[PDB]
Amino acid sequence: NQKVYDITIIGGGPTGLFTAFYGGMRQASVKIIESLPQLGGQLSALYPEKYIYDVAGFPKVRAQELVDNLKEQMKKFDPTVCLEEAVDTLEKQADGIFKLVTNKQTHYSKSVIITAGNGAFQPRRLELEGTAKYEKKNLHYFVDDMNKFAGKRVVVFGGGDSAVDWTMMLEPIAEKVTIVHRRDKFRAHEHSVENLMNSRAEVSTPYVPVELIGDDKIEQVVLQHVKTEEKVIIDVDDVIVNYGFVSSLGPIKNWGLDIQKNSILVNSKMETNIPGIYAAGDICTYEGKVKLIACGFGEAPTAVNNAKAYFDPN
Amino acid sequence: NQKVYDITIIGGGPTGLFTAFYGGMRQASVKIIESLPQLGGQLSALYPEKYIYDVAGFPKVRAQELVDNLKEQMKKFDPTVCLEEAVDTLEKQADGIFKLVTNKQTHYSKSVIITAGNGAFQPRRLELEGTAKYEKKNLHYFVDDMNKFAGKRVVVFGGGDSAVDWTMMLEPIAEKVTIVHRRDKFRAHEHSVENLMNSRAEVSTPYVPVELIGDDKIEQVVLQHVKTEEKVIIDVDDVIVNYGFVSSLGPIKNWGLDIQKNSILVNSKMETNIPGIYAAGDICTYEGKVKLIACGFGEAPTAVNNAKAYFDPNAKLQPMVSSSMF
Numbered sequence A: 001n002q003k004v005y006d007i008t009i010i011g012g013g014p015t016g017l018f019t020a021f022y023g024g025m026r027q028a029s030v031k032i033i034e035s036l037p038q039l040g041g042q043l044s045a046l047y048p049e050k051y052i053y054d055v056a057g058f059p060k061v062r063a064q065e066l067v068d069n070l071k072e073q074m075k076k077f078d079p080t081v082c083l084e085e086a087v088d089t090l091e092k093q094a095d096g097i098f099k100l101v102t103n104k105q106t107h108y109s110k111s112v113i114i115t116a117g118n119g120a121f122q123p124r125r126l127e128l129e130g131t132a133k134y135e136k137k138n139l140h141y142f143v144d145d146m147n148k149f150a151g152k153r154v155v156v157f158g159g160g161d162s163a164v165d166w167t168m169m170l171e172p173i174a175e176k177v178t179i180v181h182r183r184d185k186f187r188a189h190e191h192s193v194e195n196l197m198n199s200r201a202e203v204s205t206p207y208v209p210v211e212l213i214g215d216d217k218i219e220q221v222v223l224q225h226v227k228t229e230e231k232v233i234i235d236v237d238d239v240i241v242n243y244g245f246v247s248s249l250g251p252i253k254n255w256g257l258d259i260q261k262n263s264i265l266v267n268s269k270m271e272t273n274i275p276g277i278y279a280a281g282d283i284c285t286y287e288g289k290v291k292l293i294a295c296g297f298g299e300a301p302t303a304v305n306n307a308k309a310y311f312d313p314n
Numbered sequence B: 001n002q003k004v005y006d007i008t009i010i011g012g013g014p015t016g017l018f019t020a021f022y023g024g025m026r027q028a029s030v031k032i033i034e035s036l037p038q039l040g041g042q043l044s045a046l047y048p049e050k051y052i053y054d055v056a057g058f059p060k061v062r063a064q065e066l067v068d069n070l071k072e073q074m075k076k077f078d079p080t081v082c083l084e085e086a087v088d089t090l091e092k093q094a095d096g097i098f099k100l101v102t103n104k105q106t107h108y109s110k111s112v113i114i115t116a117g118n119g120a121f122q123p124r125r126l127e128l129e130g131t132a133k134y135e136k137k138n139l140h141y142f143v144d145d146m147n148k149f150a151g152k153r154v155v156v157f158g159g160g161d162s163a164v165d166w167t168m169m170l171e172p173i174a175e176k177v178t179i180v181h182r183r184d185k186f187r188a189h190e191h192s193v194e195n196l197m198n199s200r201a202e203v204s205t206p207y208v209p210v211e212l213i214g215d216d217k218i219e220q221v222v223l224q225h226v227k228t229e230e231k232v233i234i235d236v237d238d239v240i241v242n243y244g245f246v247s248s249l250g251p252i253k254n255w256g257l258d259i260q261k262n263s264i265l266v267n268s269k270m271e272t273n274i275p276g277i278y279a280a281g282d283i284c285t286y287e288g289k290v291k292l293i294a295c296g297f298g299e300a301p302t303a304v305n306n307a308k309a310y311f312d313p314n315a316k317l318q319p320m321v322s323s324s325m326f
């Protein structure tokens, strides 16, 4: 958007959602940039169902059940949420405005608050050749709509819970749905795996894919047995990968921020070495910093107010 | 008894309750000392029924329900709860152990975390030493039951956070709820004033009352602007004063702690100037500190871990992930 905002939040993590809540709380046009197509950061991506106990007020809380509590607390102000954008450049222009260039567009902000935790959460890719031409066409890593694969032969890679449920959702939808894993025992919930055999889903296991046959759309996938090392091809139309999520800093170190051991040096005002750029959550660090969500929750409003004193004279 | 505890927490308020939980999170014998006869601190005593919205994770949670969610969260470690004790002396003896003397007995701790308010029980009123009879009847300072002001016309005097929210929570119950302040800007969070204007709650600008029409109960309040001197009478059933300019620290001032603005000055490690003494919540202060519950909850584990690293060297600062302790 060409409209410069007031606070642009790098990271849709738990610190980023609650900080987005506090932005409107001080009359701030709030913009969130997230590398994922989903909010939640580490919780929604790495452990959404697990119970967390050291969050203030929650003797027992699910990770994602708290995320919805943060999104609902946040939708009270409706910030401009720009998903599927990984911030690449963060540069201060001649007038103090920050120029943020992502993979989509360039966003502008009077101040930028970086709640990025450990890095950007782009999914785990493959380990083949330049599949970018498959990725732009029929090679997917996220499931937006499941019905787009109805009547098409679809292959699924992975063994986790995330992979098995996606396959079980394609049994009455996908023409031919096959799930591939490297071991005979799916690293998933046991009673959901039992339903996978009690369905029309072909279960190829233990297999690992090798060759992605397709001129530009993947139409055949060459497998290979873990023990006998025989190659088995199955004709496909779309390919779905669910191995898990990965994070990494990348361009974060090259933004002129004092970074030592993948953490931004911030003061008690949550101010980095760049005026107008603030950080909170686990991505920040200082004397006695404890990498917690409870601490990241207390670093968020401190970061909004000290930025409010940066871009708005009271 | 003569147990040299590990962490003795001054204050059974909301910040101290979460701090007591996180003490057990690092395997610390926890002692809580509270001047009130009840835990909850400011919440259980001054507004136990009101709804809180700026708590991380709770878009809308009741105050006492938040206290009970903390007490339920805390009883996982069963800290030593000493009620009705106001710490008078806090001295570090020759071996580093702190000696705490309350009105009752002498307690011991390896380290001390100060989460208490002031030890007292007083918001802040105006300057009339008469009218003493309205307070026993309809001039209130505290929200006990929300229904006692329901169906009654309630007028509120003040501009702080307490004045704007009480007016906003009396809007769907009280016939006429009015907020009166001595200044042109309600010094509150911006969206609580935004919700204050967008309702039937009558919003009185800077006014100062004159005539409390009543032999013992105020039934009409004749107003007066601080500068323009306009007379506005408002029919009321209850009269509410919500200034709340904090209050003096008291026995905290005599402990050798660097104090700025009735608040203990702490570093980013939540350390006071005394090694082994920590402070968090609204009682602590530093650069850009915001007197919030969101901040005070985030300052609490900062102090527990830095204290676990104070009295126990071979313990990692970064703790064990919470899921791996259940």
Ligand SMILES: Cc1cc2nc3c(=O)[nH]c(=O)nc-3n(C[C@H](O)[C@H](O)[C@H](O)COP(=O)(O)OP(=O)(O)OC[C@H]3O[C@@H](n4cnc5c(N)ncnc54)[C@H](O)[C@@H]3O)c2cc1C
Pocket (backbone or CB within 6 Å): A010, A011, A012, A013, A014, A015, A016, A033, A034, A035, A036, A040, A041, A042, A043, A046, A047, A052, A053, A054, A055, A085, A086, A087, A088, A115, A116, A117, A118, A119, A120, A121, A122, A252, A280, A281, A282, A283, A291, A292, A293, A294, A296, B321, B322, B323
């Ligand atoms: C398995 C596990 C268990 C845990 N258990 C606990 C526990 O019990 N208690 C506890 O207190 N803490 C726990 N934690 C820690 C907790 O998850 C973190 O402290 C918390 O997530 C910090 O919030 P954050 O937003 O800074 O991190 P994150 O959730 O990592 O936020 C990072 C977000 O920013 C985005 N992002 C990053 N870089 C970019 C970029 N360049 N462009 C665009 N978007 C970007 C990412 O996509 C992501 O959404 C646990 C962590 C893990 C991994």
